[PDB]
Amino acid sequence: ATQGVFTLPANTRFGVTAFANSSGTQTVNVLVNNETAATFSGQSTNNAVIGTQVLNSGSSGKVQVQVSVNGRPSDLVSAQVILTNELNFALVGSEDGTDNDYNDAVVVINWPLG
Amino acid sequence: ATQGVFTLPANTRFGVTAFANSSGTQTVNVLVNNETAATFSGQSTNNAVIGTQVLNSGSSGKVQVQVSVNGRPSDLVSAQVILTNELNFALVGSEDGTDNDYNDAVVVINWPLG
Amino acid sequence: ATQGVFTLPANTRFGVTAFANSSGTQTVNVLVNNETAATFSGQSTNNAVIGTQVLNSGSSGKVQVQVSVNGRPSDLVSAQVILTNELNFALVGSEDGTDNDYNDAVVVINWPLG
Amino acid sequence: ATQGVFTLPANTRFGVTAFANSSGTQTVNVLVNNETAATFSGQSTNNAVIGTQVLNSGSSGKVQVQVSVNGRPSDLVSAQVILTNELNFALVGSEDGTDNDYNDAVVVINWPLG
Ligand SMILES: C[C@@H]1O[C@H](NC(=O)c2ccc(-c3cccc(CN)c3)o2)[C@@H](O)[C@H](O)[C@@H]1O
Ligand SMILES: C[C@@H]1O[C@H](NC(=O)c2ccc3[nH]ccc3c2)[C@@H](O)[C@H](O)[C@@H]1O
Ligand SMILES: C[C@@H]1O[C@H](NC(=O)c2ccc3[nH]ccc3c2)[C@@H](O)[C@H](O)[C@@H]1O
Ligand SMILES: C[C@@H]1O[C@H](NC(=O)c2ccc3[nH]ccc3c2)[C@@H](O)[C@H](O)[C@@H]1O
Ligand SMILES: [Ca+2]
Ligand SMILES: [Ca+2]
Ligand SMILES: [Ca+2]
Ligand SMILES: [Ca+2]
Ligand SMILES: [Ca+2]
Ligand SMILES: [Ca+2]
Ligand SMILES: [Ca+2]
Ligand SMILES: [Ca+2]
């Protein structure tokens, strides 16, 4: 199944935050309407926040997270969870290796903001 | 029901990261084994990361998030989600007012690290 | 925070299914647009499926679950999770006593159908 | 990433329930310790329950859901959600075709029971 693709309400502000947990340099690209809107890179085995940003879902509401290491796309796992019918998290894990910890880059999208 | 309380595997590193979305300064306490292990304070209406840290679950595995604003405990909402039977997210939202956006302080706990 | 309330897409079929795990007789009411649309009852300590039904979310998409035992409202916990940006589960747990297993009545709402 | 695999505590009673939403006849196998512990089949486009059972996680704690149609394994999606640090849901969706609704067989695993 496709992973790392989320439909937000249109014209909604959201946060996106990436964490790194690998010997490999993570490249995290965040697309909105199929266009890169944020990019983060870094290497950490201590959960560094390699980037955080605030974006708007725009007219399409389409948000995609891609994770690659040195040009190689990592395997993605994702889901969306909603608490009290209001608070939204879109979650991504990624595996760049063989150990299957799926934490090599971890991306969390949150909304609403404000 | 109790919210903001999570049982992690014992003696395991985990990340904890807080965001603010409120006109009021947020005070986030992270307890491990019923004792303060980290404290974050900050103010934003645009999802600023007011703190991030790496902690150890220690012998109890017991992690509790509390959020207070001007000394009043905020109402919490929480859950844990596990992806590919491996990647763990413990999620917290908080409400300090009347609008019920539950994003006033948003707390994400992630494990494993590394 | 409010629990057991979910906004579904409007005018969409969904499944609602209740399970019992208590010595108490569970009564589960499912409201659509603030009116009772389904009522399930039963007693089991072995996860009986006391009811399952297909409903339509109607014009508001508002679905609410309430649980009671002998007229006493149970305390509810809930969340929604979405898999591969398509497959939706709205989940309810309920507590009628003092052990805090929150499984006394368990309700699962699923969509899409078909 | 692997999907439909869950680690339960050892020797834990759990509910598993399956629904069908396809023209294809679903076969759902639930493995415990890599051995078939329950098999369900049915066909519905209206979310009919095609199986429900109570099983034991046994010494391994290893639970796997497999879905096939006409001898062909369906593509799975899965996640685990924990409410109030106590109530567990292990959720499975499956796709047997080309529409990507991932509801062809929907499987819910819940614990604790009792
Ligand atoms: C921007 C909005 O900020 C709201 N919070 C408050 O308004 C708040 C936090 C503390 C206080 C506060 C303290 C002391 C005296 C007073 C009364 N003047 C008030 O107000 C959020 O709930 C909302 O979702 C929005 O993000
Ligand atoms: C420290 C360990 O790092 C592993 N990743 C690596 O070892 C790794 C992955 C991709 C790479 N591309 C270039 C060098 C390189 C190295 C991770 O997959 C593993 O989970 C763990 O975090
Ligand atoms: C077997 C146990 O049953 C408990 N519930 C009860 O024993 C219970 C709760 C409410 C009641 N109202 C009238 C009779 C009655 C009995 C549950 O709360 C507990 O989790 C466990 O399932
Ligand atoms: C009614 C529709 O049925 C679809 N499935 C099928 O039409 C389907 C899938 C696999 C099959 N193998 C043999 C016959 C056969 C038929 C489903 O994939 C689709 O989502 C929808 O529920
Ligand atoms: Ca890895
Ligand atoms: Ca790693
Ligand atoms: Ca608020
Ligand atoms: Ca707010
Ligand atoms: Ca109980
Ligand atoms: Ca019970
Ligand atoms: Ca299908
Ligand atoms: Ca289908």
Numbering used by the authors:
A (entry chain B), B (entry chain A), C (entry chain C), D (entry chain D): 1 to 114
Reproduce the article's own wording on this structure.
In this study, we evaluate the potential of synthetic fucosylamides as inhibitors of the two lectins LecB (P. aeruginosa) and BC2L-C-Nt (B. cenocepacia).
Co-crystals of LecB with the dual ligands 2 and 9 were obtained with a resolution of 1.55 and 1.74 Å, respectively. Both complexes were solved in the P21 space group with very similar unit cell, and one tetramer was observed in the asymmetric unit. In particular, in protomers B–D, the electron density can be attributed to the indole derivative 9, while unexpectedly, in protomer A, the observed electron density corresponds to 2. The amide 2 is observed only in the binding site where its conformation is imposed by crystal contacts and presents the same interactions as described in Figures 3D and S3. The fucose scaffold of indole derivative 9 maintains a consistent position and coordination with calcium ions across all binding sites. Notably, the indole fragment is oriented such that its NH group establishes water-mediated interactions primarily with the backbone carbonyl groups of Asp96 and Val69. It is stacked against Gly24 and presents slight variations in orientation, which seem related to the conformation of the side chain of Asn70 and resulting van der Waals interactions. While 1 presented several conformations for the aglycone, mainly as a results of crystal contacts, only one binding mode is observed for 2 and 9. The benzene ring of 9 (purple in Figure 4A) and the first one of the biphenyl fragment of 1 (light blue in Figure 4A) almost overlap, while the furan ring in 2 (green in Figure 4A) is rotated by around 40° and does not lie in the same plane.
